[PDB]
Design a binder for this molecule. Structure first.
Ligand SMILES: C=CCO[C@@H]1O[C@H](CO)[C@@H](O[C@@H]2O[C@H](CO)[C@H](O[C@H]3O[C@H](CO)[C@H](O)[C@H](O)[C@H]3O)[C@H](O)[C@H]2O)[C@H](O)[C@H]1O
Ligand SMILES: C=CCO[C@@H]1O[C@H](CO)[C@@H](O[C@@H]2O[C@H](CO)[C@H](O[C@H]3O[C@H](CO)[C@H](O)[C@H](O)[C@H]3O)[C@H](O)[C@H]2O)[C@H](O)[C@H]1O
Ligand SMILES: C=CCO[C@@H]1O[C@H](CO)[C@@H](O[C@@H]2O[C@H](CO)[C@H](O[C@H]3O[C@H](CO)[C@H](O)[C@H](O)[C@H]3O)[C@H](O)[C@H]2O)[C@H](O)[C@H]1O
Ligand SMILES: OC[C@H]1O[C@H](O[C@@H]2[C@H](O)[C@@H](O)[C@H](O)O[C@@H]2CO)[C@H](O)[C@@H](O)[C@H]1O
Ligand SMILES: OC[C@H]1O[C@H](O[C@@H]2[C@H](O)[C@@H](O)[C@H](O)O[C@@H]2CO)[C@H](O)[C@@H](O)[C@H]1O
Lengths: 149, 150
């Protein structure tokens, strides 16, 4: 299932910075209001809830920068081609968050409910309304879709 | 598939049709029991994103609140029934470890015991606590969580 990763508070979406069909390794993942095929994602299940968040256009997946199992707060989120257990996430569609294997979450850097375009995303352990994400149809940005298959 | 056991987290007991039949009559109660066998296997049939039917594999019947209300009151018995409709929609919350009916209440052991005896009935109730938690595990390994969504 293909989906958009929608920041719940702002309605902006996760994008590779620059919007490329083939972002280089270590391109930062930002929030941006645009919708297009280079911000579509899929989720590749590895072990029950845990899997890879895949950028559809490039096949690269989401990593904490440097590939930590326990990335510190403020570690940047990036795309990278590699596959390993430090790039595992769970797409929590009940609590509306994205949790890294180490137990922290994807946040907008700074924690704004309304981050401007091109705000970087980071790992942070805090839970609040401004780190919530929902997973929606590329044809209807208000319709949640099931990311697990 | 995916086929799974519905395991009451606090006690390790499993959801069964009372009696363990391969073809339970409509309105057979769903109870907790320690036994493992093919007549307590379930599958989840997705209808709308998180919402779907909890299907008894042996019979094809599905989990309902008795009476099929949109908003069943607390203590309404859980049963199996052949019918499909929107009052038999549940979500399998494998993050918070519970099973929520479309009306917003959860599946509980009747009376709230965390160590209920065999044949304890299950019911709808709105409360959230450790004794209403469930996990979804492999029929071949009751300690291994499996993904129920597909
Ligand atoms: C000023 C009016 C005309 O120019 C507009 O200026 C914008 C600057 O405010 C430009 O937007 C920028 O366009 C870049 C690509 O040329 C980048 O946009 C890409 O990357 C984004 C994610 O970082 C999104 O995916 C976006 O869809 C994608 O095109 C840059 O991020 C963006 O600010 C642009 O020249 C034009 O709209
Ligand atoms: C001759 C120089 C040796 O380095 C080579 O080139 C790259 C340096 O640009 C190396 O890649 C870098 O390796 C780092 C680990 O030492 C980082 O890679 C880690 O983090 C990534 C996510 O940011 C991935 O998770 C990756 O799997 C993980 O190892 C850095 O990001 C990466 O560019 C390369 O190892 C080497 O061949
Ligand atoms: C010290 C001896 C006391 O135990 C006696 O033997 C039975 C165990 O086989 C006790 O259990 C009851 O067995 C019933 C069928 O004979 C029912 O079991 C069936 O349904 C269960 C779900 O409700 C399970 O699916 C089980 O696998 C299935 O066989 C009854 O539920 C069970 O309590 C009996 O109470 C006792 O006399
Ligand atoms: O970056 C995500 C976090 O943003 C806010 O924390 C700020 C600031 O970003 C951080 O550098 C600082 O150390 O703490 C600040 C506390 O105001 C949010 O408050 C956090 O919950 C994260 O979302
Ligand atoms: O119990 C689940 C079913 O509830 C309702 O039917 C009840 C009862 O089960 C049935 O035997 C009786 O004859 O009718 C009642 C409804 O008035 C639902 O209408 C069924 O679809 C099942 O949900």
């Amino acid at each position: 299932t293909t989906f958009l990763i929608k920041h719940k508070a702002s309605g902006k979406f996760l994008h590779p910075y620059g919007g490329s069909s083939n972002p280089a390794n270590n391109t930062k993942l930002v929030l941006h209001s645009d919708i297009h095929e280079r911000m579509y994602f899929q989720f590749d299940v590895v072990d029950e809830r845990w899997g890879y968040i895949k950028h559809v256009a490039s096949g690269k997946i989401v990593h904490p920068y440097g590939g930590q199992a326990n990335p510190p707060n403020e570690t940047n989120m990036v795309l990278h081609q590699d596959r390993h257990d430090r790039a595992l996430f769970a797409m929590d569609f009940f609590n509306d968050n994205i949790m890294h294997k180490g137990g922290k979450y994807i946040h907008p850097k700074g924690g704004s409910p309304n981050p401007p375009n091109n705000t970087e995303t980071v790992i942070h352990g805090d839970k609040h309304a401004a780190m919530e994400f929902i997973f929606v149809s590329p044809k209807n940005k208000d319709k949640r879709v099931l990311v697990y298959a």
